[PDB]
RNA sequence: GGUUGCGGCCAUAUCUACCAGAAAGCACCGUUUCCCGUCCGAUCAACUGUAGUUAAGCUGGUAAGAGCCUGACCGAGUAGUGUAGUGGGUGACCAUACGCGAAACUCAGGUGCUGCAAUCU
RNA sequence: GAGAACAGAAAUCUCCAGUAGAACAAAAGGGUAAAAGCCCCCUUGAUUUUGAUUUUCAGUGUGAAUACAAACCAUGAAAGU
């Protein structure tokens, strides 16, 4: 009804789409703030299908500003070709982004009032559920190993048992090095082959095995520690070409004169 | 390159609010809205004032702790923070002082008599004939024991005890209302 | 249960008063440009920025009761009312409240030469940092009207008071300059509000 | 062209409402557990009507959901008990449908007189690929009218299998 | 929580005023300034203006022809390194810097499960900080992936406490000593034991010492020296795993043995005597030092750091050929050794007599200087990576700094509340990590003689602490059974 | 210009009914050995990107659709209100100024822009 | 509103609406939204010690309450509360 729509108040556009939670975002954007006045950057990590998005984001009135960014689609640069959205890929992306931002900030390889003031950042996962062993916590661990000191407890890392309040480092290492994927491949090696031919098809094409996956992950970690230079694509068919391509199929709004002409014939 | 600033009148600073006051003369024509270079003069003046304020702020002593993160309230040893003095400018308060006073008719007697304030030890009190403390009040209080016990020798006396408790609570509320009337 | 008791205690007066909250009331005649100016100005007041839901027909100089009622209901000691008229265009009235009673009022009108954030250089800013102040002109320390303006702006933009400050928090400075000195018999020079990023 | 809008079973819901919350309720829950192989859940009561004697929060009903081929394994048996002959009613506007039966012992499970005789309310919900959007926590969205399940669509899908009937409107 | 007294109203009023502007308009020196090498060389009474630190560095570089920064110190009174222009012939004393900066360590990484007993020893690999080995009460020893902070290649075969663990200078073999009278060599990359366990000792192993690379034959593998509580020391050949020479001059338990850069071996024992042994002379004692009243504990040498990280550096670059590795190790040894303008190495001997002695065993048999002032026994002593300063740890909760050139006392690092067990120097010599019986670790900065940061988090006494060659990571181990890694 | 991530303004951003989307990425989708949680792998956790689908989500185009928004001498510097004077009126009131100062209504227009990182014929 | 053996006007379940005529301690500005509501997990606090009001009879360089402030505590991965 007209009255219902008039009284109805539309929520925020960024909240109407299920992407941001203003209740949790408020705490990070505006902290206690009566303590010492210091900038507080936010490490936003988001997981999508076939890709992982990690970004270091600050706060500004005009909108969030990204200081550095990393994506799982850049992992093949280091030799990772499969499982870009897996736990090991999340850990690798976290380590890569952490080391990249550390190198860009000058910590490796108004600066007054020593010391260097290491880059502290708070992780943000948005709507991602808080479950122990989630690959988001794997990205957190990778970033922590990369030099970004996110304050975090080990209550959600994989292998954390509830019966005993102790983290099993062996299970965490296995998850970091793709041990679970290798175990699944070994299990499928003697199970139905149709699933083994469909699942892990890329692994079979690349001739990957149980230990080769861990070796590849270690080599990728070493390369990440070696080349965080963040080289983007050559960008063939540059911005103007892409704009022309989009405009080719784009539908333009009809002018009011066209609407009047159409209505004149309609009536 | 130069950082020193010289003005006919020294700048009055307010470090407690990160504020600086400049009483120097300003040219009406230069700052007129019709002047194209209006913005440049204001920018230069603000730059000089900010340079002076920054120099004064950095001249202040700064804390240097040797602790770790630990409690997030404390600052890390790597960090060093300028110790801003108390504000010099007087600003009006948003509300009046809450220093309301009332003796409730009890403090007057307590002063007249030699009744010292109770030590306020705690809720715990020993419940004889049992191997449990069962504090006086706060949880499973002993005052409720009479209701849960099985024989009430010498109308249910438990209802009488509950009525007495209600009467005492209502009397306390009435005393509070009487004291509020004052 | 006692959930609202904490809110009442927070609203209750204390020896050390909490950070003053700013309430921006959009007037009946408020225009789009005035609304944008108000939003841009309040962006610096975060997280102490509050915006009313609907337009309000307010006549502060004819009846101050609505302002007191709004302050009491919202517990906002600082209030800014947008107003636009043929004689008083882009009139931004600032109001202070002491115990929900109106403390002082001063009408400020933004000239048409205003520039919004979008039109400035593409540079970033940090929200929540305490702004620096630089007052230019002896009238601020001697003229009662400019003294009141200085006090109001200091109470509005200073944010939380702290005895310890970080150097990293000195990212921007708010500068207020008078358009030249003046004497009796001349209109009050317009106050120039400028915010500068520090390098 | 209907590439990814084929009607499919969402989930099978079995419910047994009882007038009390004692031996009969427990026995019905056991029957549901042994039929579907999953522990059922107890439904509370919102208000004390007092007409049937039910009280507030009496835990009056029990139900259990079944999905996948297991749901079809029970749906086919139930329709066989119903002779694969429903009515024009029993279907919801949004494309859902359901029925009920008595003497559950007919559909497989032995009598076991220690458990007793019971009936079961058979309800089914139908959807199409992409229904996860309506339930996904992130970026919840509506569904286009061209994709929403309807009474006629559900009836047509039911006709396609089990050799069922559309007996007189 | 007891709080520092608040400032008075007078203090607030004084602080409310502006002051202390650093304009320093001219600050023309009243007395000429000259540069003199700290070691022996005087290099020239100039009268420059308010030249900054960069200008002084450029002046020294162009004087030396390198226009290699040097740290400029004033006359050693002032003893203060425009920094010194506020106090006013003036002589500025400079020393080589070996440019490098270890980022201060202020945060831990995580608590890692592992051995079901207290940790006993640890040692970072000389070539990379990503791998580290810890010995604990549990008979097994474990290598830790310092990057992921997880166990890797656990060592098994021992049946008693792993008292001491050491890493070979080449980084290819790990030597572990246990309470059992055996020593085992393990491959770091696989954990396999290199042959049968070394046997022949009658009592538990007290310390291990690896032969320096620059003294080893080109292409051959270094020998391994070991000490046992029985008072005997055996020089094991890592290839044949057979002790060629057995020395038992000490009449009581040997506290430790250090392999000097000149080939001599210096060891301390419970017999209150220090003996110098020469491997070249068929492992035969040459001199005996008798000055300690109590038993000698934790003998150390100035070159210990270079010998440990011989052929390697903070960058972690590995040598290409054995000859290149030997040349690099010799250059590293000479850099510290030749700081006096002549090939010499200093030795500091600690003992429970509340005194430490400085010796030059090759130059003279008498003690060069006597370091005294501690209230309790000195548990640990660590020469600086360049020999500039000597630091010792004592049970009296105090850590004292002494001049490495002549043993003169410098300053005391106060702040500990319990007995100090051991300390480790930073690669750049700027920082010094320390551990004590108390619940928290501490790190000190020698430049300012002030506490850098407190590192609490350990749940019990901490017995082990080590600093990586690159300075990126610092590990620790204690009675809490949890291994902790610390880094900037 | 399309798109993903983080946001600012917070309906020109919403609601109903219709139509298209080249490449990429969202999205649905496929699997339950492992981490993970549910009566239900529906939600969520993990694996797979392999067997597909642009049906749906989302973006875009339309209704003289409902609401919504903007500029205005259109209401208007009008009404309303206020302060002053033997001006008339016995007074109340009437005419004036003298400062604030509206809204309905009406005229015309519109049915998302924009801050940072990355990617696409 | 559309449907389900007993089961109907009120029993419980599935679907579409609901600006909130949910329970919010509050009347109430009309507010409260991936909550201040509903379902689930962990949790004590009347903890001490410094400072300004009050009291006294070894005026107790502390014996206690009151207010403030600091440590400590609960929770979460975290911001924070």
Swiss-Prot record, chain A:
Keywords of the record, alphabetical order, are: Cytoplasm, Isopeptide bond, Nucleus, Phosphoprotein, Ribonucleoprotein, Ribosomal protein, RNA-binding, rRNA-binding, Ubl conjugation
Enumerate the SUPFAM superfamilies for this protein.
Answer: Translational machinery components
Q: Could you tell me where this protein is found in the cell?
A: Cytoplasm; Nucleus
Question: Where does the UniProt entry say this protein principally localizes?
Answer: cytoplasm
**One of the GO biological process terms:** ribosomal large subunit assembly
Q: Which Pfam families match?
A: Ribosomal_L18_c, Ribosomal_L5e
Query: Where are the Phosphoserine modifications?
Result: 144, 153, 212
* Position(s), cross-link Glycyl lysine isopeptide (Lys-Gly) (interchain with G-Cter in ubiquitin): 141
> Molecular function terms in GO for this entry?
5S rRNA binding; structural constituent of ribosome
Q: What is this protein called?
A: Large ribosomal subunit protein uL18
Gene source species: Saccharomyces cerevisiae (strain ATCC 204508 / S288c)
From Swiss-Prot, chain B:
Q: What is its subcellular localisation? A: Nucleus
Q: Which UniProt keywords apply?
A: Nucleus, Ribosome biogenesis
Could you mention a single GO BP entry for this protein? ribosomal large subunit export from nucleus
| Top-level taxonomic group | Eukaryota
Q: What InterPro entries does its record include?
A: Ribosom_reg
Q: Assembly and interactions?
A: Component of a hexameric 5S RNP precursor complex, composed of 5S RNA, RRS1, RPF2, RPL5, RPL11A/RPL11B and SYO1; this complex acts as a precursor for ribosome assembly.
Biological role stated in the UniProt entry: Required for ribosome biogenesis.
What's the protein here called? Regulator of ribosome biosynthesis
- Name the source organism: Saccharomyces cerevisiae (strain ATCC 204508 / S288c) (Baker's yeast)
Q: Give the classification, highest ranks.
A: Eukaryota, Fungi, Dikarya, Ascomycota, Saccharomycotina
Curated annotation (Swiss-Prot), chain D:
**How is the subunit organization of this protein annotated in UniProt?**
Component of the large ribosomal subunit (LSU). Mature yeast ribosomes consist of a small (40S) and a large (60S) subunit. The 40S small subunit contains 1 molecule of ribosomal RNA (18S rRNA) and 33 different proteins (encoded by 57 genes). The large 60S subunit contains 3 rRNA molecules (25S, 5.8S and 5S rRNA) and 46 different proteins (encoded by 81 genes). Component of a hexameric 5S RNP precursor complex, composed of 5S RNA, RRS1, RPF2, RPL5, RPL11A/RPL11B and SYO1; this complex acts as a precursor for ribosome assembly.
A single GO molecular function, which one? structural constituent of ribosome
GO biological process terms, alphabetically, are:
cytoplasmic translation; ribosomal large subunit assembly; translation
Q: What is this protein called?
A: Large ribosomal subunit protein uL5A
* Native source species: Saccharomyces cerevisiae (strain ATCC 204508 / S288c) (Baker's yeast)
The family annotation for this protein states:
Belongs to the universal ribosomal protein uL5 family.
N6,N6,N6-trimethyllysine modifications at: 70
Q: Which GO terms describe its cellular component?
A: cytosol; cytosolic large ribosomal subunit; nucleus
From Swiss-Prot, chain E:
Q: Output a single Gene Ontology CC term carried by this record.
A: nucleolus
List, alphabetically, the Pfam families matched: NLE, WD40
SMART domains the record matches: WD40
Matches recorded under PROSITE patterns: WD_REPEATS_1 (PS00678), WD_REPEATS_2 (PS50082), WD_REPEATS_REGION (PS50294)
- Sequence segments annotated as region (Interaction with MDN1): 19-101
Q: Where are the WD repeats?
A: 114-154, 157-196, 200-246, 249-287, 325-369, 373-412, 415-454, 457-488
The record's region (Ubiquitin-like (UBL) domain) falls at 28-98
Family the entry assigns: Belongs to the NLE1/RSA4 family.
Please report the name of this protein according to its UniProt entry: Ribosome assembly protein 4
Taxonomy, top ranks, is:
Eukaryota, Fungi, Dikarya, Ascomycota, Saccharomycotina
């Amino acid at each position: 009804s007209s009255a219902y729509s008039s009284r109805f108040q539309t929520p925020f556009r960024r909240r109407r789409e299920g992407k941001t939670d203003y209740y949790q975002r408020k705490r990070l954007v505006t902290q206690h703030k009566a303590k010492y006045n210091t900038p507080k950057y936010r490490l936003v990590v988001r997981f999508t299908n076939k890709d992982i998005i990690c970004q270091i984001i600050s706060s500004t009135i005009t909108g969030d500003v990204v200081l550095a960014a990393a994506y799982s689609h850049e992992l093949p640069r280091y030799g990772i070709t499969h499982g870009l959205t897996n736990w090991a890929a999340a850990y690798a992306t976290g380590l890569l982004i952490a080391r990249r931002t550390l190198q860009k900030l000058g910590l490796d390889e108004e600066a007054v009032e020593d010391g260097p003031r290491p880059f502290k950042v708070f992780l943000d996962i948005g709507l991602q559920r808080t479950t122990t062993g989630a690959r988001v916590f794997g990205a957190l661990k990778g970033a922590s190993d990369g030099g970004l000191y996110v304050p975090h407890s080990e209550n959600r890392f994989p292998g954390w048992d509830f019966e005993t309040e102790e983290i099993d480092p062996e299970l965490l290492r296995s998850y970091i090095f793709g041990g679970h994927v290798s175990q699944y491949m070994e299990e499928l090696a003697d199970d139905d082959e149709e699933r083994f031919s469909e699942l892990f098809k890329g692994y079979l094409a690349d001739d990957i095995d149980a230990d080769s996956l861990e070796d590849i992950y270690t080599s990728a970690h070493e390369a990440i520690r070696a080349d965080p230079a963040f080289k983007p694509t050559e960008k063939k068919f540059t911005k103007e070409q892409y704009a022309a391509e989009s405009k080719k199929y784009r539908q333009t709004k009809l002018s009011k004169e066209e609407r009047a002409a159409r209505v004149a014939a309609k009536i | 390159l130069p950082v020193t600033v010289e003005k006919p009148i020294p700048v009055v600073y307010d470090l407690g609010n990160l504020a600086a006051f400049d009483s120097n003369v300003l040219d009406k024509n230069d700052l007129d809205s019709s002047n194209a270079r209006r913005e440049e003069k204001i920018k230069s003046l603000t730059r000089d004032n900010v340079q002076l304020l920054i120099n004064q702020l950095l001249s202040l002593p700064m804390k240097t702790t040797t602790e770790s993160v630990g409690g997030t309230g404390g600052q890390s040893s790597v960090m060093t923070l300028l110790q801003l003095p108390d504000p010099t400018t007087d600003l009006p308060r948003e509300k009046p002082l809450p220093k309301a006073k009332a003796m409730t008719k009890w403090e007057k007697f307590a002063a007249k008599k030699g009744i010292k304030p109770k030590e306020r030890a705690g809720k715990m009190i020993y419940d004889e004939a049992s191997g449990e403390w069962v504090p006086k009040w706060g949880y499973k209080g002993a005052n409720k024991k009479l209701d849960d016990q099985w024989l009430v020798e010498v109308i249910d006396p438990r209802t009488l005890n509950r009525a007495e408790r209600k009467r005492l609570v209502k009397k306390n509320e009435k005393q509070q209302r009487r004291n509020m009337k004052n | 249960n006692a959930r609202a008791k904490r809110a009442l205690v927070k609203r209750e007066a204390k020896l050390v008063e909490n950070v003053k909250q700013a309430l921006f009331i959009p007037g009946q005649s408020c225009n789009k440009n005035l609304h944008d100016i108000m939003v841009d100005l309040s962006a610096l007041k975060k997280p102490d920025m509050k915006r009313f839901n609907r337009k309000n027909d307010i006549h502060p100089f004819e009846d101050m009761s609505p302002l007191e009622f709004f302050s009491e209901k919202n517990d906002c000691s600082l209030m800014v009312l947008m107003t636009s008229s043929k004689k008083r265009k882009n009139n931004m009235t600032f109001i202070r409240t002491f115990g929900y009673k109106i403390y002082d009022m001063i009408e400020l009108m933004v000239a048409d030469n205003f520039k919004l954030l979008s039109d400035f250089k593409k540079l970033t800013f940090t929200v929540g940092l305490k702004p620096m102040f630089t007052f230019q002109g002896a009238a601020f320390d001697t003229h009662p009207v400019y003294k009141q303006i200085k006090s109001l702006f200091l109470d509005f933009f200073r944010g939380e008071s702290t005895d310890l400050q970080d150097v990293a928090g000195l990212q921007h400075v708010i500068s207020m300059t008078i358009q030249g000195d003046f004497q009796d018999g001349e209109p009050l020079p317009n106050v120039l509000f400028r915010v500068y990023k520090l390098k | 062209q209907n590439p990814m809008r084929d009607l499919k079973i969402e989930k099978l819901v079995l419910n047994i409402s009882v007038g009390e919350s004692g031996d009969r309720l427990t026995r019905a829950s056991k029957v549901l557990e042994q039929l579907s192989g999953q522990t059922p859940v107890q439904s509370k009561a919102r208000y004390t009507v007092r007409t049937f004697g039910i009280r507030r929060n009496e835990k009056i009903a029990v139900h259990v959901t079944v999905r996948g081929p297991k749901a079809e394994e029970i749906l086919e048996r139930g329709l066989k008990v119903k002779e694969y002959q429903l009515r024009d009613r029993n279907f919801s506007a949004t494309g859902n449908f359901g029925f009920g039966i008595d003497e559950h012992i007919d559909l497989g499970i032995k009598y076991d007189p220690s458990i007793g005789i019971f009936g079961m309310d058979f309800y089914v919900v139908m959807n199409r690929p992409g229904a996860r959007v309506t339930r996904r926590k992130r970026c919840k969205g509506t569904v286009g009218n061209s994709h929403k399940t309807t009474k006629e669509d559900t009836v047509s899908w039911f006709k396609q299998k089990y050799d069922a009937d559309v007996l007189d409107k | 929580s007891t709080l520092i007294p608040p400032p008075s109203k007078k203090q607030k009023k004084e602080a409310q005023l502006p002051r202390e502007v650093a304009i320093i308009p001219k600050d023309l020196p009243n007395v000429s300034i000259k540069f003199q090498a700290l070691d022996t060389g005087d290099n020239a009474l100039r009268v420059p203006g308010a030249i900054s630190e960069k200008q002084l560095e450029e002046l020294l570089n162009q004087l030396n022809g390198t226009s290699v920064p040097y740290t400029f110190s004033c006359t050693i009174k002032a003893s203060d390194p425009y920094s010194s222009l506020i106090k006013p012939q003036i002589t500025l004393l400079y020393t080589p810097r070996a440019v490098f900066k270890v980022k201060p360590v202020t945060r831990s990484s995580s608590a890692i499960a592992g051995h079901g007993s207290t940790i006993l020893c640890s040692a970072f690999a000389p070539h990379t900080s990503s791998r580290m080995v810890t010995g604990a009460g549990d008979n097994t020893a474990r290598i830790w992936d310092c990057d992921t902070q997880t166990p890797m290649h656990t060592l098994k075969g021992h049946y008693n406490w792993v008292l001491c663990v050491s890493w070979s200078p080449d980084g290819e073999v790990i030597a572990t000593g246990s309470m059992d009278n055996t020593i085992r060599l393990w491959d770091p990359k696989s954990g396999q034991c290199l042959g049968d366990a070394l046997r022949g000792h009658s009592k538990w192993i007290t310390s291990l010492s690896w032969e320096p690379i620059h003294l080893v034959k080109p292409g051959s593998k270094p020998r391994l020296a070991s000490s046992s509580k029985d008072g005997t020391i055996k020089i094991w050949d890592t290839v044949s795993r057979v002790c060629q020479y057995t020395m038992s001059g000490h009449t009581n338990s040997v506290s430790c043995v250090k392999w000097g850069g000149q080939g001599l071996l210096y060891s301390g024992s419970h017999d209150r005597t220090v003996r110098v042994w020469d491997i070249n002379s068929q492992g035969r004692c040459i001199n005996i030092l008798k000055s300690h009243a109590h038993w000698v504990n934790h003998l150390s040498l100035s070159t210990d750091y270079a010998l440990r990280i011989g052929a390697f550096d903070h960058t972690g670059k590995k040598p290409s050929t054995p000859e290149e590795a030997q040349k690099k190790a010799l250059e590293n040894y000479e850099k510290i050794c030749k700081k006096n303008g002549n090939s010499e190495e200093m030795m500091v001997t600690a003992s429970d007599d509340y005194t430490m002695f400085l010796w030059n065993p090759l130059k003279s048999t008498k003690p060069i200087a006597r370091m005294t002032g501690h209230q309790k026994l000195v548990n640990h002593v660590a020469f600086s990576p360049d020999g500039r300063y000597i630091v010792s740890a004592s049970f009296d909760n105090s850590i004292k700094l002494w001049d490495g050139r002549d043993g003169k006392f410098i300053s005391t690092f106060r702040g500990h509340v319990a007995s100090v067990y051991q300390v480790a120097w930073s690669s750049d010599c700027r920082l010094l990590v320390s551990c004590s019986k108390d619940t928290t670790l501490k790190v000190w900065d020698v430049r300012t003689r002030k506490l850098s940061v407190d590192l609490p988090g350990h749940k019990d006494e901490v017995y082990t602490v080590d600093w990586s060659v690159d300075g990126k990571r610092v590990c620790s181990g204690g009675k809490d059974k949890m291994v902790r890694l610390w880094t900037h």
